[PDB]
Write a protein that binds this ligand. Sequence first.
Ligand SMILES: Cc1cn([C@H]2C[C@H](OP(=O)(O)O)[C@@H](COP(=O)(O)O)O2)c(=O)[nH]c1=O
Ligand SMILES: [Ca+2]
Length: 129
Amino acid sequence: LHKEPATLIKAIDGDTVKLMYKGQPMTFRLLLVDTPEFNEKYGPEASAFTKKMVENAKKIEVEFDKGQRTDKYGRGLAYKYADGKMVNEALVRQGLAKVAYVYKGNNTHEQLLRKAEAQAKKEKLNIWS
Ligand SMILES: Cc1cn([C@H]2C[C@H](OP(=O)(O)O)[C@@H](COP(=O)(O)O)O2)c(=O)[nH]c1=O
Ligand SMILES: [Ca+2]
């Protein structure tokens, strides 16, 4: 997989963000994770966590997986990095997202993220409390 440049346009919620990618605005949905909707428990915390992470980043990158790059809503599907740290993994390690939506062919970082979820559950963090 390869990291590509993007710039922040605006935080949306725990697992979606609007970025400018190859010069075009697009909403990205983070691969392999599910945050609670803003209206649910830990929803506000997840949105705040991603917002801080993406707004504080000096360099944002997106990394597509091997499979579909857009979903049925026209959202980009990617791993997102903020100054070299993967947002997808960081949300799971913090118990602010569950590993979810694992579809054959877009699952390169599945085992990395499961490993993060195990540690978050071990620690009873957030969703796992
Ligand atoms: C993460 C992800 C979501 N989706 C679709 C599945 C779900 O369809 P439905 O909307 O029909 O439930 C929806 C979940 O996204 P959200 O969690 O953002 O709602 O997005 C994909 O198709 N591929 C993916 O990799
Ligand atoms: Ca969600």
